[PDB]
């Protein structure tokens, strides 16, 4: 049709939002769909050890790495065109899996898919700001975006299990092709153009791009290696220190140089900083709780992964119910109360997991997951606050900061709280007490590796005390990390409450 339209869009632009929203939802499911499809692929091909781990690590590494420069590319190339290019590349790579030369091919496909997805999430958030220029309307527009980006993590297991039970493994991407294609069929017909002019844009900076990409990838991979190998190796130490110093170099280059790639000047405004801090610790909660509760449902209640994922619906429904009512509450109560209130309610819902539910049962888990979904829904207010006082080009820039902080929060939460949970499980199990009466040596490692491993080694060895002891230890560890997360969440809530100024309000931008 046309990729250059002024005046934004008429009153029907809301439909455009929908066309984006649901599509983004699909885009945020793929990783989950891959994870529960990991064993199946392993049966059909050669995981080759480290190759199987690279398969799941490459998409997160690339998404966290190529997220800053691609935002500038989208800004200088045409936001609508960048979004359409990303969607088309995503669809093509999803159709490319049909050729199953299971090999380095999978790694290359996942790398290309991550590169394509790096243009989706950062660009969609900026396009939402571009289409909607009204604070009251932009708040209720961003609420729907918040629901999607995350209803995706909860709904991933259900759709993945339903897809894997029928059809075959290669349908894991085949479902994503007809849904993404429709996207572009609408993405070209109801989207405006931004195309920031050459007036304030100079030539591209090679050092900025290379340094930013390498620093971000190094940081993420160092965090992952810390989680997997422990703080004893020297290579992750040197990698994290080099990544930090390179990020410092990047910040110092972007601070003073003219027309910077990522203008670090929004952090001066408190309104930006409040939302940026809020998003990280909003994602911390699910990054821990979703995985830990999935394992708990897997073990304690003895459910299949599909049903285990299905049992986690209350967390999703809590967010789906609370998010639409959030902007209305924020408009009349201000952000200073509403935004901290969501984090506080999430903290309360993760406290009720420890204080009330030491011998946890599913009723307590659901009545806690609802409150966690409330703090999930607070992301809408936080996102709004971020784009409250920001010009168009700066908003296109700031979507990248939002998405990068979001992904870093997910990685940090998963690594740190999973490591804490594993350490607590290992210390509570106390496998050294089961030596003279059974499990010794190699089997012991399995008992320390995971709760499922301990349960099945107890089943095989014929000694039954190990199963009950391991299940109790896992329950205690899960509950303890829930309490620790609650403490962190309250501490962050106090900071976010103190940060937001009094006169700030999501409506009446000026």
């Amino acid at each position: 049709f046309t990729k250059t339209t002024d005046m934004m869009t008429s009153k029907k632009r809301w439909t455009a939002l929908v066309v984006l929203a649901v599509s983004l939802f699909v885009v945020t499911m793929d990783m989950t769909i891959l994870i529960m499809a990991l064993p199946e692929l392993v049966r059909e091909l050669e995981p080759s050890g480290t190759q199987q781990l690279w398969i799941v690590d490459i998409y997160s590494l690339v998404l966290a790495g190529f997220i800053i420069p691609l935002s500038a590319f989208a800004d200088k190339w045409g936001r609508k065109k960048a979004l359409l290019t990303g969607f088309a590349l995503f669809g093509l790579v999803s159709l490319a899996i049909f050729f199953a030369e299971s090999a380095e091919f999978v790694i290359a496909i996942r790398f290309l898919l991550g590169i394509a997805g790096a243009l989706i999430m950062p660009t969609t958030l900026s396009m939402i700001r571009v289409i909607f220029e009204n604070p009251k309307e932009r708040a209720t527009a961003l609420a729907v975006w918040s629901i999607a980006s995350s209803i995706g993590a909860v709904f991933g297991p259900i759709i993945g299990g339903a897809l894997l039970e029928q059809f075959s493994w290669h349908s894991a991407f085949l479902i994503n092709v007809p849904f993404a294609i429709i996207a572009v069929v609408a993405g070209l017909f109801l989207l405006p153009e931004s195309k920031l002019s050459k007036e304030k844009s100079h030539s591209w900076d090679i050092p900025s791009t290379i340094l930013s990409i390498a620093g971000m990838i190094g940081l993420v991979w160092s965090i992952k290696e810390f989680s997997k190998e422990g703080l004893a190796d020297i290579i992750p130490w040197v990698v994290i220190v080099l990544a930090i110093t390179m990020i410092v170099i990047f910040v110092k280059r972007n601070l003073s140089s003219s027309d910077p790639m990522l203008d670090v000047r929004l952090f001066k405004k408190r309104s930006f900083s409040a939302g940026t801090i809020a998003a990280f610790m909003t994602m911390f909660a699910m990054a821990s709780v979703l995985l830990l509760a999935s394992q708990w449902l897997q073990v304690v209640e003895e459910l299949s992964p599909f049903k285990a994922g299905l049992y986690l619906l209350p967390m999703a429904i809590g967010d789906m119910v609370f998010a639409p009512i959030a902007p209305g509450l924020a408009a009349r109560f201000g952000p200073k109360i509403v935004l901290p209130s969501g984090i506080g309610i999430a903290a309360i819902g993760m406290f009720i997991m420890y204080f009330f539910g030491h011998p946890l049962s599913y009723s307590t888990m659901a009545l806690a997951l609802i409150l966690v979904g409330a703090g999930m829904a607070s992301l809408a207010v936080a996102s709004a606050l971020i784009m409250l006082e920001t010009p168009t080009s700066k908003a296109g820039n700031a979507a990248a900061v939002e998405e990068s902080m979001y992904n870093l929060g997910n990685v940090f939460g998963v690594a740190v709280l999973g490591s804490l949970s594993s350490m607590l499980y290992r210390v509570f199990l106390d496998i050294s007490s089961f030596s003279s009466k059974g499990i010794v040596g190699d089997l012991a490692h399995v008992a320390e590796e995971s709760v499922v491993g301990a349960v099945e080694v107890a089943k095989a060895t014929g000694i039954k005390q190990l199963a009950n002891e391991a299940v109790t230890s896992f329950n205690d560890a899960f509950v303890a990390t829930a309490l620790v997360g609650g403490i962190i969440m309250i501490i962050i809530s106090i900071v976010v409450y103190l940060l937001i100024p009094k006169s700030l309000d999501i409506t009446k931008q000026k």
Partner: nanobody
Amino acid sequence: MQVQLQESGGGSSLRLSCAASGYRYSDNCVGWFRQAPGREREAVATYNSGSSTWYADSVKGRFTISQDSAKSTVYLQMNNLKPEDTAMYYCAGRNRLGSYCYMTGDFAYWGQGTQVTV
């Protein structure tokens, strides 16, 4: 299923026996208590975490506890009795968590009651 505990062996060294009920891995997961006439309920010879037998300070050496998986039961043998005991000697079951039974905490199920005479 709500677990039901039955006791026997009590009456006029003596062996008390407590029968188990609906339970998976029904071992190392049932303990012994006693409600003294003068005092309240007390903990005599239960199972701790890992592999430990928590005998009371009074009857640490006198009493003994045994368990057999087949026909799931627990046996408590008392020798060299003293001016205490009597009591009720309740059987006790650990608080189930899902289908598995163990849990650090207090006991939820308490059997019938009395008739240990010494």
